[PDB]
Amino acid sequence: AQQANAAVTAAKAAVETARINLAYTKVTSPISGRIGKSNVTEGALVQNGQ
Amino acid sequence: ATALATVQQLDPIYVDVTQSSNDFLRLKQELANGTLKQENGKAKVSLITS
After folding, report:
1. Residues in B touching A44 (Cβ below 8 Å)
2. Which residues of B touch A (CB under 8 A)?
3. Residues of chain A with C-beta less than 8 angstroms from the C-beta of B1
4. Do B1 and A44 make contact, defined as CB atoms within 8 angstroms?
5. Are B34 and B40 in contact (CB under 8 A)?
């Protein structure tokens, strides 16, 4: 039972992990107001924290 | 990290209009006029290509 709760613990780690990553696949705005310019075009590899 | 190619589209084509500062103000004076400005969000402008 306890080791099963460790498996459920890693399970919620994975579902939460994909839930934040799959939450950040969409790109939205931090705040409101007038945007400047785009930098990167589509079909291009970008990095997190680059 | 290497990129393969790059494509464009040529039947529409952007024209980024390089402009000074104060004449835009005078265009703001055209915003105080608006009388040659029709279709007001846009309108045609005659090209002079090279």
Report:
1. 3
2. 1, 3
3. 45
4. no
5. yes
**Residue listed under structure tokens 């400005």:** B37
What tokens does B1 get? 């990290």
**Method underlying the structure:** cryo-EM
Resolution of the entry in angstroms: 6.5
Contact A11, A17 (CB under 8 A): no
Q: How far is A33 from chain B (nearest CA, A)?
A: 20
Report how far residue B48's alpha carbon sits from residue B10's, in angstroms, rounded to the nearest whole number.
Answer: 18
Q: Taking CA atoms, what residue in B is nearest to A41?
A: B6
Q: Shortest CA distance to A46 belongs to which of B37, B1, B12, B6? A: B1
User: DSSP alpha helices (H): ranges in chain B?
Assistant: 22-31
Report the 10 Å Cβ neighbour count for A50: 6
Cα(A20)–Cα(B28) distance, rounded to whole angstroms?
46
